[PDB]
Design a protein around this nucleic acid. Sequence first.
RNA 1: UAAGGUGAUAUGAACCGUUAUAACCGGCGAUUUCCGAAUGGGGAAACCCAGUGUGUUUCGACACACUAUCAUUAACUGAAUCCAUAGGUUAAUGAGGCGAACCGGGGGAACUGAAACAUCUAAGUACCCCGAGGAAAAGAAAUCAACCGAGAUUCCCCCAGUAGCGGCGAGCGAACGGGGAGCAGCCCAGAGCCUGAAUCAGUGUGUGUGUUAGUGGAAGCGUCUGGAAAGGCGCGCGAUACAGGGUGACAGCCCCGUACACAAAAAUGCACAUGCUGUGAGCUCGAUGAGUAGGGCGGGACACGUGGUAUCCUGUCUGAAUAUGGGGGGACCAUCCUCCAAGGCUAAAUACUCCUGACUGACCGAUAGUGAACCAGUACCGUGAGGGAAAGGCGAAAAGAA
RNA 2: GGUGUGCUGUGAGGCAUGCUGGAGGUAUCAGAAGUGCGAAUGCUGACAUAAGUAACGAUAAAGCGGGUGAAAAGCCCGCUCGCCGGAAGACCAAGGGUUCCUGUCCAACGUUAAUCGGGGCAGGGUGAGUCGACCCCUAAGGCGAGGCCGAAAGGCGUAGU
RNA 3: CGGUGCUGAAGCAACAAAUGCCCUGCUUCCAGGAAAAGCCUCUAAGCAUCAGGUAACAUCAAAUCGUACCCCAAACCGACA
Lengths: 102, 62, 77, 93, 46
Amino acid sequence: AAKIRRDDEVIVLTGKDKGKRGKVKNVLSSGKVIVEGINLVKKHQKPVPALNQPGGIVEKEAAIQVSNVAIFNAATGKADRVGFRFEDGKKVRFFKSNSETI
Amino acid sequence: KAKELREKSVEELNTELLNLLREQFNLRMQAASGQLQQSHLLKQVRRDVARVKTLLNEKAGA
Amino acid sequence: SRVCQVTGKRPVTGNNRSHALNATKRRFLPNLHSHRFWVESEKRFVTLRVSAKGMRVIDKKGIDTVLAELRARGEKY
Amino acid sequence: MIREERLLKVLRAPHVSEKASTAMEKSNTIVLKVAKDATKAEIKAAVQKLFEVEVEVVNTLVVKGKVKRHGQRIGRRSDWKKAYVTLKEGQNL
Amino acid sequence: MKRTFQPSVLKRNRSHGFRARMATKNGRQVLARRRAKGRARLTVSK
RNA sequence: UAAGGUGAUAUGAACCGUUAUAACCGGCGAUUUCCGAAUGGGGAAACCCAGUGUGUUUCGACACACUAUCAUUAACUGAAUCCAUAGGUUAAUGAGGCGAACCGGGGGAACUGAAACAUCUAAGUACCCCGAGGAAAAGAAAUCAACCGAGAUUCCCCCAGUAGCGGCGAGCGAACGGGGAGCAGCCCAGAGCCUGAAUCAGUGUGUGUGUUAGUGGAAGCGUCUGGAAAGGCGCGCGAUACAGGGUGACAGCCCCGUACACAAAAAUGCACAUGCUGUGAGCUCGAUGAGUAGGGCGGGACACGUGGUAUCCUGUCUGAAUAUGGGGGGACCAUCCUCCAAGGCUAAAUACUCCUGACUGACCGAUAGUGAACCAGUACCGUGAGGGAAAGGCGAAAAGAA
RNA sequence: GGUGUGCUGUGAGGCAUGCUGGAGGUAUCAGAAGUGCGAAUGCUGACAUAAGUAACGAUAAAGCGGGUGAAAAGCCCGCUCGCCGGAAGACCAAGGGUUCCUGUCCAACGUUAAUCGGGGCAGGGUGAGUCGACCCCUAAGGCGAGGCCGAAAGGCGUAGU
RNA sequence: CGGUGCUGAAGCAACAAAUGCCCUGCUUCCAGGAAAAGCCUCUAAGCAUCAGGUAACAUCAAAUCGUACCCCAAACCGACA
Ligand SMILES: [Mg+2]
Ligand SMILES: [Mg+2]
Ligand SMILES: [Mg+2]
Ligand SMILES: [Mg+2]
Ligand SMILES: [Mg+2]
Ligand SMILES: [Mg+2]
Ligand SMILES: [Mg+2]
Ligand SMILES: [Mg+2]
Ligand SMILES: [Mg+2]
Ligand SMILES: [Mg+2]
Ligand SMILES: [Mg+2]
Ligand SMILES: [Mg+2]
Ligand SMILES: [Mg+2]
Ligand SMILES: [Mg+2]
Ligand SMILES: [Mg+2]
Ligand SMILES: [Mg+2]
Ligand SMILES: [Mg+2]
Ligand SMILES: [Mg+2]
Ligand SMILES: [Mg+2]
Ligand SMILES: [Mg+2]
Ligand SMILES: [Mg+2]
Ligand SMILES: [Mg+2]
Ligand SMILES: [Mg+2]
Ligand SMILES: [Mg+2]
Ligand SMILES: [Mg+2]
Ligand SMILES: [Mg+2]
Ligand SMILES: [Mg+2]
Ligand SMILES: [Mg+2]
Ligand SMILES: [Mg+2]
Ligand SMILES: [Mg+2]
Ligand SMILES: [Mg+2]
Ligand SMILES: [Mg+2]
Ligand SMILES: [Mg+2]
Ligand SMILES: [Mg+2]
Ligand SMILES: [Mg+2]
Ligand SMILES: [Mg+2]
Ligand SMILES: [Mg+2]
Ligand SMILES: [Mg+2]
C-alpha cells in the first residue's frame, strides 16, 4: 500500500534538490526516505577511540519527506502519481498518466 | 518450523525439548563468559522451546 | 436480634413527642418472649422467640401450620 | 532425583571477580550466579551433571541489588543468589 | 529530647499493615479509597 | 496485510525478511510465577508450615492432584433415651470479592433560616448500612369522578405558587381536570372435560443484518519572490471527493484521507425461520386471600404540624362481615354512585456513564484547562487516615558545532 | 508580540513609522462576555533591601618537614604536641539500607579551600547442621467454627488458632 | 616499600581478686512470688509373627532466610554532617 518503495527511481518535487533524480536507498518508518545523492548534509563526526575511527566532516544523505518525491516515469521523463490495481490476483502499481504498470 | 515438529510423536518432542534446553544452557555460559558474538541465537532457541512446549500441551489434549 | 420468628415483627423507630412537641428519636420494640410450644405431631417441644401477637397467631392457625411456614421461609427452629 | 529440565535452569553464569579467582586457585571452589529460588541440593546436582565434576559442598548467599540513579530517575537492580561450590580435591574445570 | 516517632517495623505493620487494613470493613474502605485515588503505595511495607 | 522489520527513552550490537511461516492488524486457542475474596493451616500482603492421594527411584528424593467456610439438596451414620431427634461424615450445586453514577430498602444529623429560639426550617438532605438490575421501582383499581363519565404504572407540560398547611411566623405546597411521550395485559388460591393444542424458556440449524482486521478511491504544470512554495502571476483539470491532517510559508489536483463502492476463515450481537427439550392452551362448573378490615393507645406517612381530620403504615392491646357481603366518595349520618382489600407476575415511555467509537463547540491554551499537556496521585509532607506540587516550545532537517 | 519615534482626538484612545520578531492578523456593521486592577496583613513566580552586615554549631590545640597536585592551614606520610579513656574505646539489639571496600571524578553537596568525603560514576563485597530467624511451646492480648446477642454494620465468646 | 616470605626462645610460681561463677543454692521476711511444650514415667483403646521399644555399628540428612556497614551516632529519632 506504499506508493514509494525501496530501489525506486524518484525525482524530487520540493526543496533545495528540486528536479534532481535518484534511487531510494531505504524507507524510514516515520514517512521519510533516503535518496542517494540527494539532500546531503555535512556532519561533524567526532573521532572515537573504539575502532580508532578519526573525526572529520562527512557528507551523508539526509532523510526527506516521502511526499516531496515522486516516482519518475522514464517513458515520459516526468514525475507521476501511483495507483493500484489487481492484474491476476496480485495488487500492482501503475502510473496515473498512461496507466502503465510499474 | 512448527510444521516438521507437528509430524513427531510425544516422546520424540521430549527428546527435542531436552536438546534445546541443553543448547540454551550452553549459550548462557558462552554469553556470560563473553565468548558469544552471535547474540541473536539466544532469542532463537528460546522461541523454539516455546514452540515445542506448545505442541506437547496440544497433543496432551489430543 | 429482636425479631419475632412467626410474624417477623422487628424494632421500629419513631419519636418521643413531649408536651412542647420536642421530637427525640426512639424505638418501639416488639413484645418478644421465648416460649416452648408443644408440637403434638412430633411429640416434642419447640422453643420459639415470638411476640405476644405471634402466640395469638399460633393458637389460631395451629402450631404445625406456623412451623410449616417457617420452613418455607427458611428460618430454623 | 531432580528433573534435568529443572537442572538446566538453576545455573545462570559463572561469577568472575578477584575473590572468585583466588577461591578457585586456593580452595578449589567455583563461584556461580544461580537462580533466585535454587536450593543447595539443586545447585549440587546441577554442577555434578552439567559440569561432570564431583561436588563437596555448596554455600549460598543472596546479593541485594543496588539502588542506582539513571539520569534523574532512581532505579534498583535485581537481587540474585551467589553460590560457592566446593569441588573434590582432584577435579578441574 | 525524646521525639514522637520512635520507629518499630513490627508495630508499624501490626497497626497500619495490609492485613491490619483487611481485617475490618473500615480498613477495607481505606484500601478502596487509595486504589480509587491511584496511590502507588496502598499501605506501609518494604 | 506486507517490503520492510526486532515497543519507548535510544543509538549500537547481533540478526530476520523481500511474492510469502519477517514484522504488523484481527478472530479463536495455548501459556498465565507470587500476593490479593485467597479458599490446605498460619501470617508482619507478595511469606512460613503442612496433610492425603497417586505417578516416579539414581533411596539423595522428586512430579502432579486434592484438602476453606457457609447455604441448599441427598446419602450414610448417629447421643443423653426405646423409638426418635440433635449431632457427625461424604457428595452435588451455589454463594463470598471488586466497580463511577443511576435504583429500592434499613437507619439518619447539624450548621443554617426564623434577623434570638424550643414548634417549625434545613431535610428524609449529608452520611452510614443492606440489596439489586441494565435500568430499578411502580403497575392491571376495594382508583377517580359527580349523577355525566373516565379506565394499570411511569415521565414531561399545564392546572398553580392556586386550594390548603403553618409559633397562620419563617416557610411548606397539592389534587381534580387538561395537553403529550408510551401503551399490555395476566396468574394462583380447583376440580373435570378435552388433553397435551397457545406461550415462554432452554438447545440446535438456516437466512438476513450488524460488530470485531480491511480494499479501491478522482484531478497541475509554467513562472516570480524566497533557505524552502502549498504564496504571487499565468494557463489547466477533478468534484456524490473544497471533512480534516501532514508535507521546508497559506495545497481540491504532493502525501494520508474524504465522497462513494466493496470485503470475513473465525468468533459474536440482533433479528427471523426451523428442529429438539421443558413449558402447558381451550371449555364447563366451582372457588373469591382472618388475627385480616375495623377499633383503643403511642408514633409515622400523606402539601395537610391532631386540628372538626378523611386516607395510608404499625409498636402495643383487641377484633368483624365474608357478595343476603365489604371498601371508598376528606369529621359524621342517610341516599346515590363507584369499586372488590387482606396472593402474585408483567415490556415500553424514565434515571445514569467507570467505559468504547464517531462527531461538535461565539470552551481553555501552560498561574488557563483535569491535581496531572512533562514517567502525577509522582516528588514531597504525615504514625496514620490523609494532604499534595513544580515542571511544555532548538531547527524544515541534528545538519547538535570535525 | 516587543521596543522607540512622530502625528492626532475632550477623554478612554487612535494612526503612521524605525528597529526587533519570523507567521499569522483582520476592516466595517452587528453579536456574546472569564472585558479593563495599585491597594483586599490578596494568590503565584521573579527580584530587591538590610549587607558583603550577623554567622560559619561546644575554648580538646595545634606545629613543622616531605609527598601528591593547576592550586595544600584542612588530603597522604613522618616527627612532635594536645584531648577522651565506665569513653569521645570495643560489641550487640532496634532503626537505617550499601553509608562497607577499590578505582576514578570535584559541577552540585560539605556552613571556607579541597587533590579529601558518609558527595558523583564504575566495579567489588555479606559463604553457617551448631549464631539469629524460621521451627516446637505458651503469657498479656488478638482472632474466633459452631454459639449467644444485636435495626444493618456488628458485639462477646466456646472448641480452637 | 603498603607489605610479603622464612624462622622462632621462655611459655613458671606466688599473691591479690571481682558487681562474674557455684547460686534456679543457703538464711530470712511478707507484700507469698507465670504458663505450656521439649524431657521422664504410667497405663486405656489397640496391637501382638508383626508393629513398636532399648542398645551397638554403619550410613544419610540438617532445608530456607539473615550475615556488608553505622549504634552517645555525620548512617537511628530530632527539617541540618
Ligand atoms: Mg561448610
Ligand atoms: Mg546462609
Ligand atoms: Mg500502635
Ligand atoms: Mg486464610
Ligand atoms: Mg493458603
Ligand atoms: Mg436410642
Ligand atoms: Mg436547629
Ligand atoms: Mg423539626
Ligand atoms: Mg448484570
Ligand atoms: Mg420490576
Ligand atoms: Mg487504500
Ligand atoms: Mg487519491
Ligand atoms: Mg509534500
Ligand atoms: Mg363527602
Ligand atoms: Mg356508571
Ligand atoms: Mg496546570
Ligand atoms: Mg508562556
Ligand atoms: Mg496545578
Ligand atoms: Mg512589528
Ligand atoms: Mg499587578
Ligand atoms: Mg483602588
Ligand atoms: Mg529577603
Ligand atoms: Mg549595620
Ligand atoms: Mg560589625
Ligand atoms: Mg563576626
Ligand atoms: Mg566547627
Ligand atoms: Mg604541610
Ligand atoms: Mg550511594
Ligand atoms: Mg569509606
Ligand atoms: Mg565548597
Ligand atoms: Mg561515596
Ligand atoms: Mg460465626
Ligand atoms: Mg472474639
Ligand atoms: Mg557476617
Ligand atoms: Mg559484621
Ligand atoms: Mg558498634
Ligand atoms: Mg562511641
Ligand atoms: Mg548528634
